[PDB]
Structure formats: structure tokens, C-alpha cells
Symmetry: C2
Subunit: 99 residues, 2 copies
């Protein structure tokens, strides 16, 4: 698709057999999702940092569908003011900024 930016670029994602809403955020390096019980091994990761860090769980090679594009990538799971799709998953879906 082509998404214009008059509104916040909120899209539907599919992960853990759940449909969710997330913001396409080019200002974010990584993808952070509210708590979800993804299966298997994970490793601790610190995100944020301004005023202190937030600890989340890094899951790798996660199948996730974004706007009906199935891709594989790293998803961080833990507290976030809203689900955020970062640049790491945007490269996987072949999402670019164009003007």
C-alpha cells in the first residue's frame, strides 16, 4: 500500500494468532509490543534509557503479519504506551519513505 501521513499510520498486525493494532514508527529502531505470551526462548533487553531503561523480552525470528505482509523478525515484548512497529520490521516488509 501507500500510506499518507495526514493521520497516524496505525496498521493491523497479526502475531501469536492475535490481531492487534500498531503504529508504523520510523523514529523507532526496534519493534515493541505490549505483553504477549510468545513461545520459546528469549533474552532480556533494555529499551528507552531517558530517565532510566525499561526491561523487555527480546524474541527472535518471530512470524508476524503486517498489513497482510507475512515477515520474520525480532519483536520486543513488554510495556509500551502503544504497540510500535520499528524500522527493523519495516525493512522486512520492504517499507520505504518516498517523496
Amino acid at each position: 500500500p501507500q500510506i499518507t501521513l495526514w493521520q497516524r499510520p496505525v496498521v493491523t498486525i497479526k502475531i501469536g494468532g492475535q490481531l492487534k493494532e500498531a503504529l508504523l514508527n520510523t523514529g523507532a529502531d526496534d519493534t515493541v509490543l505490549e505483553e504477549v505470551n510468545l513461545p520459546g526462548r528469549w533474552k532480556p533487553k533494555l529499551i528507552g534509557g531517558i530517565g532510566g531503561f525499561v526491561k523487555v523480552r527480546q524474541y527472535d525470528q518471530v512470524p508476524i503479519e503486517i498489513c497482510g505482509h507475512k515477515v520474520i523478525g525480532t519483536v520486543l515484548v513488554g510495556p509500551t504506551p502503544a504497540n510500535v512497529i520499528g524500522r527493523n520490521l519495516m525493512t522486512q516488509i520492504g517499507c520505504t519513505l518516498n517523496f
Copy 2:
């Protein structure tokens, strides 16, 4: 241009006869720039909000050049961990997300 998102989408902007660097951030509604002595009238605006707001100066109809695209738009001037181009200026330059 077409900007891929393997790296942070930092671009050169031109404002107040100054060249600066700023991040193209689809996660941001508005454009926030470090203190710069833009001329003329402005009105107070509160930004952020999580843990408290930050007061900045809203300047309207500001000429700004982004990647050599001259546009006109609202720029908020005050503290920011780095200069940020928000969706408001991205619509002016005709910048979209594509995949």
C-alpha cells in the same frame, strides 16, 4: 527520493538560513526543533505529556527546506533529544510510506 529504513532516516533541513540535521519520524505528529531564534509572533504549546509536558514555542507558516524540498509549515521550537520532523511536515513534502 526513496529512503530505505536500514538506518535512521536522518535528513538535512534548512531553516532560519541554517543547515541542520533532523529525523523523519512518522511516530511524531508535530515537528520539534532545538532552540532557534525564528522571527516574529509565536504562541505557547505543550508537547510530550508522559510524566509532565514540555513547553515550546509554536511558529506558523515557517519556510523550511527538507531534502531540498521547500515547504511551509508549523514548527515547534524548544528542547528535544534531537531535531524531529513530524507528520505535519511530511504531508507538505508529499512523503508517504510505501510497501
